């Protein structure tokens, strides 16, 4: 089997991407944030504290003939941005782009933090990291991908995120029309439960490539590119007037600037992020200070190849017995 679903930016900045997901019988379609940096499929639901729901579409398990309470199971998750959610668990039928999993754990939120409430466009998350990070207790649950894997034509999924445009998540096949050149594969460590890999270096604009190992995670659920302070300083030094602002929370730059590209290495291959992808617009409405899309990972504890980086590539998440990651230009 295979599946193919379109993923759409939630706003004009590509702050996140939503993908429609069918849950239950009859289908209830919710727009979920596919997150390769976490491993819980959780939704706004009929159980979510009413004051914490503001515009989201909810899953109502009592209206699904295939829903079953997973008795005694609870979940609770905290994300890198300080947001969180928790609740109980049902199993139900879940379909993405025509690919169906029966008995998928669907984690129903009883509580969500303010950032989730405030984002009316995101009805939940669908985790695509390794199932070892799943938070369900006392019986850990598998991700949608892990459940689907054995049925897929090939044990892979691909992320093809758009810049200010829709893109595609495919399951079970590699669309050879969706990228240019060849796919370069690179080793993955699953020791921390992430799609963790080592970039071979970087360049700023038309500058020379610096060969240096940068360990980080491929994370579709993180908006920006978070890299070591040395790398980030080298980038922003090429933008007149750019500075790190503790009050704003990162690097800012004059909105009048033209940003240089940023290149990262995948083995001997190179992925180029155009300068425009690094512009996250005014820090506040009407400001002439703009927020940068490349930020320091110092004090996160991990480097993160988030959407800024991933949307410049066609990315293969290879879930074979020894997982790997593939990157191609597009």
Curated annotation (Swiss-Prot):
Query: What S-S linkages are listed for this chain?
Result: 255-290
Enzyme group, top EC level? Answer: hydrolase
Q: Which residues form the Peptidase A1 domain?
A: 17-328
Keywords per UniProt: Aspartyl protease, Disulfide bond, Hydrolase, Protease, Signal, Zymogen
Active site per UniProt:
35, 199
Q: Which residues, by range, are in coiled-coil regions?
A: none
Q: Give the catalysed reaction(s), semicolon-separated.
A: Hydrolysis of proteins with specificity similar to that of pepsin A, prefers hydrophobic residues at P1 and P1', but does not cleave 14-Ala-|-Leu-15 in the B chain of insulin or Z-Glu-Tyr. Clots milk
Q: Tell whether Lyase is among the UniProt keywords.
A: no
**Single GO MF descriptor:** aspartic-type endopeptidase activity
Q: Name one GO biological process term.
A: proteolysis
Record-listed E.C. numbers: 3.4.23.22
Could you say which protein family the record assigns here?
Belongs to the peptidase A1 family.
| Name of the protein in question | Endothiapepsin
Report the gene name: EAPA
Mapped onto the parent protein, the portion here is 90 to 419 of 419
